[PDB]
């Protein structure tokens, strides 16, 4: 409750979902679309969480039996707390994310793909509806993230890093990204280029998965090891948690079209051109 | 001018022997290996040896130890080919090839006893038949969490008795726990790791690869569609296997062990495949883009820990895959042809790969005189202002000649830049009259200044359009100068490119692709204290040179950065010279092209550029400093190796205006599709049996 | 729950 | 500064010979076989247990007796320290006065023969952080190449540096930590809209900072903007009277001093960072008004807290100091210096003995500074291995709230760090400083 | 319980048995609702 009263951009997240259009359908199709996205993105982010090191997961992930029954109650508590203040549109999202906790057996790609997919499948030209539903969908994704981050129940130590107000930072980042994305491409929109965007989005995701499994089958014989599971000792995991929290907002959501092409016959001072990294510290021994 | 009957002079044999010694000892401590290049039976290795060792002035690499041939000192700074074709009238290529092969034979018998020649095979990797292996399935379960004491993870490098069942059971983990029959002394720990890591939701197999090692030109001369010659070589490696010195030929065997283990339409189609001459099973697994083979080339860079073997002459580019399938399809691709090296007169070949720049190192040592650093005590005696160069005045819109246009996207710019450079090369190639004999020429004076100047233009355009939020955050692009680099490493291998087999555009294309590399190394630099990415037009120079443009020490710092490369002998000096001057000019181009026509974009981007009036003073300081009792050898050497068209603002701005005019004219014709540069293979469906 | 380490459930019940 | 008659009130011939002999005898008596295993732990806390932790002066370096402060002044003045006692380790002020001392000791070369170059301290802070060291080199008349391409902590160690007088080590330390302070400010402001990159043309730094608080590159009063008050809420509450004209210049002395003295103590963290960033953008340009304002801002005193990063323990850092004093109990010179005549040519283990006598003085029942600090560190915070003082927020905040009671705490940390380097018994001060990291 | 809700059948049907069309006329005209946790509370109570 306190980390929510102590912020500035929660009302903006609240006002972003499902405006009563004029007299119109009143976001019924939006209700369906958001529920579908909760349903699928639950499995999506859970299987993303499946292959992780320690120190990056909640204690509600290691216990064997009754693992999908605790998340239900935690999300119900979060929805009660959001309702308690005034935010009746942020509690519905947690109700959805608690209903969709049964099936628990790089991301914006899947978000836009699913949005375009379901929208074109349902409407097979009003252009405002598209914009408000796209805004609601994209903000709902970041809301999923931030809602799941109100956890880890580490007595006091997890919340004392240096930020503790991550909601405003995440809101600013995603607001800039979505403003750019909406202004540049999704304009002059009619019922011809939705199918196009859907085709290229599906092709792009297929390329992403193909290269993912390829580099997964390629990374083993190389002599370039990155640990991916460092330690389970309860003194180095805190270092890594603090490092992730600090350097979280030193990254961006932008993707590049040529990131598997490399320079050849470099010198010793031209190696940095092959790193493809942001905030790259140089380490010596 | 003898006819070169059978032998050479004595001074030439010493050079040839020291060349052979340097070759065999290149990686060090190996003056015995079987890296025997067979010249007569493989003509594409003769030309490799001529390009890399025979026609190159002699220089010894890092080696400080003592190696068998003694000593190198009589042979330094001499090239075998230039002495040969000036001692005799230049004969045919077959006598020279036979002669060099015979002397390599006697050299390889004098050393290493009597072990036989004929190595340097070609490698084709292959791993999967239909699915789930080819090789004896020494699959590895690479799950983590449970090694005894170290960072190591799980391994199950299993024996040949793994042999699986039929379609009876279809689940990998199921068949995994099924075959725990006996497993002497390893059964219980195997079931331990089984019940251990069936959870955590990951189980890996990853069985290894196998390399076919045929000679390329000895078995694929005729019989086009390489797949065909590979399969016909594969069916000749059966036959009452008792062979002698035909190694890497147990592949018939490994597949037998697999065929007797699965089902019995596979023995049928397999044995009808043999001894019918029309049954293909090589079945390419990708789209097979332009650079087919990955030839091996040495370098003074001490090739990194990625080592395969000292027999791999060629290799598949790793974006072209192969898998041994039945009942499949072979899509039509124009890159399956078998193209071999065409023999040439050995003079036109040496002349077709030659540029003056790479002789800089050999002029330096011949002239000596290494410049000395400046030693700040002397710096306070020569600098008299210390004033900090601010100059924040206004721009005069009278005579700027509107050219810029901020409405073209970036991919169109990349396409148009590549096309413009291709047109320039097309123009330079045909020089009147190309009448025989063409003795020897250098790259036309003023070409590198064109690549570098046309690549700085496009990089700065990318940066400027990214600063104004005009590019969608899903199709961004770093280093537009990648698309040029790659595009000129394979420009004489693309169908219908107008430079297909020209044989004269190689050294123009190679020149042009070793620079594009030198532009973004300046424009992106990541300083030493807070390393991150910035998207600016002047921070790269400040990080590379370690000074600010307004400081009174900027020109001295630039010239000292160059002096560190002038010494030791290095062609990087010229390229970095040109790149720095180009960045300085492009700053004052964009500043006044935005200040005069895009006042909003300008009031946003004004703090990412320098000024047209600070750049003028910087350039005047540079040119004044070069011509003063020091740094003078630098200027004479540069003017000896490159053109003096930089230092001329009006000759540099006409090139920018010409490129802008070219864009405007040939933009209504630009709908090409941007030849792909990635290194990840494009897969085909291949829904074959994996159940 | 009651974890933070247990591997099974120590579920209890409350209301706010 | 000294010729307010001396040899009469602040300097005797020195009875500290017997003190040092007895002290060496004592430390060599403790330095024997294994009956006591912690060397720098039993000779710090000699008598126990007395002098209870918390009674009203545990937070201050001295008790309520003026004679004790006078004695500390006398001890520092007897050795050549003098200036480091009346000024703290303030970056700007100590730089100013050390450059004045340097200019007085070599007057004829600088201003009569004019064979060497001379820059003021306000001008050195206006160069980029790689040129500052070169400009310091061509003023202290040392030989070195200009272009480096490496970091300073690796280039410094490539020449003799068996250096001349200590002013040149003091200025090296001050430049190193001013660079650290600048980098920390730039890295910690760093919002999702500001982004404030590296060596970035000081003029453009000021333009970009003013175009972000009030959305226009012209100067504005930052205490009235909406970006300043995003975390908390502010009120104008200024005497809006012109005095004597409109458009206060955002660097005004009255405005800044008023807001400081009225409400700096109830700010967040972003607001203190914004205040120090405004002052720094003033200092990177010339702007004498920022040079004057930086004399009361607290961030220029506590830049010494960035000095302790090694994972040793406090006892080892005391043992290094003890071993550099005993290193100079053999040679004849120098037994003592008389005063702070400012042409006095301070040496190294003069600094060594001064720091020791300053840190380890008692008044008839009262603990020293070392004992109060060690008791706070081990019984209060319960931390050995002193590099965890800056590794966690809560420990660091309590540590910095403790140090802020007295400004002699910063002088204690300064004099203690300068002489507790590892390789201090063999090499100089700046050389050991660069070897340590 | 979730995979038996009125809105669980379709999301388990991606290989189209003519399910998209009736899904879409249920969502366009008819009122399509996600399952409420209030429904699951009574099942929970009963089985406990």
Numbering used by the authors:
A (entry chain A): 972 to 1076, 1147 to 1165, 1200 to 1360
B (entry chain C): 25 to 715
C (entry chain A): 827 to 830, 863 to 874
D (entry chain A): 196 to 632
E (entry chain A): 730 to 777
Please give the exact wording used by the authors of the publication that reports this structure.
Remarkably, a single protein complex, termed RhopH, contributes to each of these activities despite their separate timings and cellular locations. The three subunits of the RhopH complex, known as CLAG, RhopH2, and RhopH3, are conserved and restricted to Plasmodium spp.; none have significant homology to proteins in other genera, suggesting that these proteins and the complex they form evolved to meet the specific demands of bloodstream parasite survival. Upon host cell rupture, RhopH3, but not CLAG or RhopH2 subunits, facilitates invasion of the next erythrocyte. Some 18 hr later, CLAG3, a paralog encoded by the parasite chromosome 3, inserts in the host erythrocyte membrane to form the plasmodial surface anion channel (PSAC) for nutrient uptake; other paralogs may also contribute to PSAC or, in the case of CLAG9, to cytoadherence.
